[PDB]
Design a protein around this ligand. Structure first.
Ligand SMILES: [Mg+2]
Ligand SMILES: [Mg+2]
Ligand SMILES: [Mg+2]
Ligand SMILES: [Mg+2]
Ligand SMILES: [Mg+2]
Ligand SMILES: [Mg+2]
Lengths: 310, 310, 310, 310, 310, 310
């Protein structure tokens, strides 16, 4: 959903502060009759303050809508505050306000950060500057790359010198949980942005082949690996391509990190290298469905299997 | 119930302060044997302080009484405090104390205000002067008209530039809930006290005809619409008339706002216009039961129906 | 789903008997690896007997599939028995078996009949020939028209000399309940197949205008009215048309009862009269979205409203 | 545990009938003081009948013993009856009684058969001769090979023309459940005892490599595959060897079916082929821990992965 | 309580049959106003049949009485039936009826027999003649001695060739449970009425010294041992003496089995041998409180302790 | 477990402070792939701080490990803090840090101290110096002897001028409870370290013989008695000997307090006196299993028994 779904802008001393919505103001908005002239304007409830633009009604779950968010949970307020805390660390100028609030962000990413920020064991609980960097990356108002320390979080299921792998907890989420219960996705983040030695890559690939054999290793180009079910690689190719296409139409720069060719699924490296060369979706997606002949380390499966036998 | 059911007056520096009753003092009063000479005087429990006059015993629920209030709930204290907070914002002089405490008020209205005052999303939680205006209107110690910002509250089910419509939550109430579970009533308050354009009236009437077709649109003359079941319009006519009659006997001024003739139920506008002309109950009530031939906007039902089909 | 999802055919003395599936046989089928040569053939589990053809896997709910049926409930067995009881009342010859088992039927209709058959108050519990007629209509192996006595059932919400109106209980269903909780549909069945006097039609239309004002009165042409939300008339038009189209391609006769023009929604009568004239979907569906100028009984709303006021 | 833990022998007309123990007779036995002269003799409680020999005390769970069985469950009686039903289908002669009752059997195998026998969907519920064959195989009083139709049961997780694979449910068991909750074991039984075509083997191996990559495919030589965690192959090698060794000392014939070399784990085929050649445990077990260079079908993993991508 | 608390006599063909009371007839009796002339006569409720004599009111628990029985439990009916079943196995003649019904019996003993009779594992469930012998002993209408096979029952906590020891379950009882939760009593019954070898006595005494060191071994003279807390031996001496005294006044024969002098508590053997010589209570009870110098088997404690160390 | 399982060292101003681990840092460590070069080094999670050395993985309960501790309970943090509070009361120098953190301690002892420290009735709650002395004794960084005031705690079941006896509550523990539910152990601590008069010893031995007859009175040499089941004396002899042996190899001084010969179990005094003379395990352990002929106070059992009879 867009940032304008959680906060509205307020000017103070020619510097913009952002304010979370009340959920009762959202609920009043969803019952409002509004002119089409006013659907892009912020709504005013008399009782509960300002509400998002009525054009965003579909972002909110209703008796009719299940494809939105659960805006009446406490989590909605925590995520709105988190966004607002980060938008206020910038001082957005009037020229920029409409653009920042238009940015579409992952609610599940933001919720996971709240879970990190409120956990006293997590470094984000103790470093207001780390949390701010983490949130700024999430809401796309920073060009730093998400790494382990700035990751959205989840359950750590594997760690080594170079990588931390997280299980994404989206089924348990309060604000916008994934509905199909057959969902499983993992994330591999970089600990540092340095080059990685071959042994630390071998360790990762061994774990993925042994424990995540039914998962593809892909990426959306923003610097980290995503461990997704093979039955969903086709949908991921669609969304990655739409984003690559939409950014070519808008002029936004498309720098896509293909990551290590030894870790990424071979077919996915093909589909995304082709995409990075400029080919259309159909040229690109057909490479997902080919069976390619060749790979990087051999016998990794056997080593781990023989370790278990002991 | 009368204001004297929640507070008693105490003098300090020739200015009256009001003090909420303890519910255990009420419970002691309900067991007291009192002279008829003393039934209009405030009762003294030895253990729990002052108690309402014993003539008010019927206002309180007992093993025998179900037509009173649940004075032992925490809500009774909150409502008593709310009343007392407003009575203390005035400085009632000795000549006036008996009259203010004699005023009969809607407990359900007062309870709903408590629900607004204790809700951090509600403007009443943040504006002590709005809350005071709201309470003063409720306890009839102000001649301002209830509007959306000063409304008793409830669930917002419709809003536009001119109107907010509230569902009255009286079944869930703690202090004096409505007992029949077949109850449904709605309230339409004015957002501002200005004149209203024809489009904003058309929007309201369309919603009422489409979503509240089984409800009459009536008013008690105090500036807002009440959406009530047709099976209860007869009882409402009684109470509105009794009030109009009792105020003619007492000399209290009867200014009755008939509201927009395009919104009010046609028959009800008739019964109340006749009442405002001075006719008796029987002349007036018989106009409720006539079927009148004609109305203000045609095809509003069809427009909304055709919108839904898309 | 097709009849072959609940029973398989077995020959005895050149007369076909049908046998319900075990749900564990279905569960074994859903784990089976089967040649494409064999996907239209009945599956053999070793432990639990015969199972439906693997081409029907999608009809059954899985960890992956939610758009099928809950075949592991007791209700699945009751519905399979009901089908089988009716298929055995016929003696289907070898030429016919594949055609009967190919027939697609409403599981919710069949489940509702089970609820009637097992209820000792219901005439279906007492008349094995009524139940058989009811089931034969449901599984499309009879050309009699569904009437009140043979209806699928539900909660009776209105009855008069000519009509019974049923609320469809599909949200509570065990085998294939409707998932959106915003669902409400009603059914109006004929008590007898005779002509209906004008007063009995006036009674029905009055109830629908007063109590079901937010519902369209439509029909699928098989002899009874369906009371559906206006927001769903578009989807109903699609399915009715597909059926009318698919039967023109297959040569199946399309007799469509347009029912009383005074009861059916005006726009729907148009879309279906146009369909019955042979026009394409787009010519027909556009008549759903027009606003037409004129209707049959006037003042019915007012009469019922005035009755309530008393 | 030994068969003498569930039944005792009783002679009628020079033919032996077997009788299940009462669990209260077992409980009396566990409190009994018995001469060492009598520890191999059946115990007599006065109140509850005959009880197992006191030398079997350790087979029964106590406040002190957790490595025995839950003899006070209803399941103990069902398993005792099942054993007794099968022992009575034979007519064991006096020379044989001590030998049959000495036979050690898998309680979990017997419990699983009870779960099949009491399930109306299961063929064992309907065929008293199949159930008897199944039980006779289980209690080692038959030289037929366990196949799908005679299998102990469990959840079917894969089936094809040649094989059925079962998940062993031992954690849910009442009489002697597996305690570590980290347990998972699967069983692959033959549907028929015929030769198996190469495609049906390819189908099995593809499923095992894709869905059971973290499992070894081994066998105990009695005609079916066992899918066990690699971390437990070492323990299985011990038990298989002890049995092979103990049968060489006792003269019992050791026919060990090595099954298909394309399905069995390569190392396990080695350890068991060596065992079948007569080598000692240490020569044999060391072959489990080698990493061997080569295998039967290549690209099976890739085919299944590419199927999922579609 | 007396037998007349559970049944009343009814004559048929000059042979007496006994009939259980309805608990509602008892409840009517406890509200009845009755002449003192009629307190020893059976009461007639009009609605529920015959009720016990009103002189027995104190035997029944009331809002006022806790020292009686819970006559409204199902257990009361089962115990009444058990008594009645045994009274009907005799054919009590008119001369005898008043005497049998006057007999005072242990309700807890009778309840325990019901628990044995309704247990399919218990021989009493299968032998109507054993159950009858057991009940006849209990209600003192038989001079046979209670043994293991005829015991009242409970949990078996020790058994050997000569003895069975039972834990008395009186805290869990439905009809008349022991109220202090600090209660523990055990019973040692003879398996046969033969002489007992010295090893089987050594086994019993070893178990009592090791596991029941805080318990006295006493007897009430009726052929079995009672394992009671030392803090209650004084009360037991009272009741045993009262019975021995009351039977000397009534002429009932007093045969008191002193049991094995090696098993009985030394002091208790003294108090009861003195009682059997004719001394008064004070001569006898003072022997309970002496500390006597010497005993039968030495080192039994040490043997059992050393067994445990291994 | 070793002290390094709860805290890691941090240097400040050439004085060492110790810091508790986060349990999420431990959980990240248990998923980490670590070089063998690094298994003795403290682990760094990026998100949750420092974690114990990976060589300690087995000290922590996992889905696979039940023989470790429940490090995710709040109790783990309280025990880590308690350790850290005591390690910081010392100022451990760099030479010493590795040695202190290597010390193996009783987690159950530490948990019991937490239960004392957080109890406002306990003197440890009020005396930070008593608590520190108590913890320093527990973690073996003090040579004072545990006494009643510094005891680990538990339920007091007996007290006199010289001794307090505690029931060890290890089954209820959160961090590392004893799993067998058949566990019972008691502790007898000295109130003062003075000589004890003969009457106060007689009082203790009387209580142990009467109420703990099935328990051996032993000691591990550190100044207090342990009341353990005879069935476990053999295991205790093993552990006491291993400690005595391991300290002879390491040069740590072995001062073993044999305590009062009148209180200790005779056989145990023998096994430990022999151990203190230098004999091997087999010479020593065989003295546990002998039956020795003679003891200190006679008739103590009889006195207590006779007290109870009154
Ligand atoms: Mg990415
Ligand atoms: Mg009004
Ligand atoms: Mg139809
Ligand atoms: Mg095998
Ligand atoms: Mg006796
Ligand atoms: Mg010690």
């Amino acid at each position: 959903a867009e940032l304008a779904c959680f906060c509205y802008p307020h000017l103070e001393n020619d510097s913009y502060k952002f304010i979370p919505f009340n959920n009762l103001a959202i609920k009043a908005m969803l019952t409002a009759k509004v002119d089409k002239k006013d659907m892009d304007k912020f709504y005013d409830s008399i009782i509960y303050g300002i509400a998002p633009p009525p054009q965003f009604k579909k972002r909110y779950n209703t008796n009719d809508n299940s494809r939105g968010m659960n805006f009446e949970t406490i989590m909605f307020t925590k995520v709105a505050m988190l966004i607002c805390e980060a938008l206020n660390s910038l001082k957005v100028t009037q020229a920029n306000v409409s653009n920042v609030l238009s940015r579409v962000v992952s609610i599940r990413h933001l919720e996971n950060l709240v879970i990190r920020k409120e956990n006293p064991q997590d470094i984000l609980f103790h470093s207001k500057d780390l949390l701010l960097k983490s949130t700024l990356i999430a809401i796309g108002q920073s060009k730093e790359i998400e790494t382990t320390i700035t990751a959205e979080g989840g359950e750590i299921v594997f760690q080594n010198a170079a990588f931390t792998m997280w299980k994404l907890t989206y089924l348990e989420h309060q604000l916008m949980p994934i509905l199909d219960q057959n969902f499983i996705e993992y994330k591999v983040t970089l600990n540092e942005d340095k080059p990685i030695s071959d042994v630390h890559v071998k360790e990762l690939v061994a774990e993925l082949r042994w424990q995540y054999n039914k998962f593809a290793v892909i990426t959306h180009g923003k610097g980290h690996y995503r461990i997704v079910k093979y039955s969903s690689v086709a949908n991921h190719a669609d969304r990655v391509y739409a984003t690559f296409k939409s950014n070519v139409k808008t002029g936004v720069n498309n720098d896509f990190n293909l990551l290590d060719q030894r870790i990424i699924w071979q077919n996915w490296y093909a589909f995304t290298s082709s995409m990075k060369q400029g080919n259309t979706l159909d040229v690109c997606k057909r490479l997902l469905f080919q069976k390619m002949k060749p790979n990087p380390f051999k016998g990794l499966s056997t080593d781990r299997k023989m370790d278990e036998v002991s």
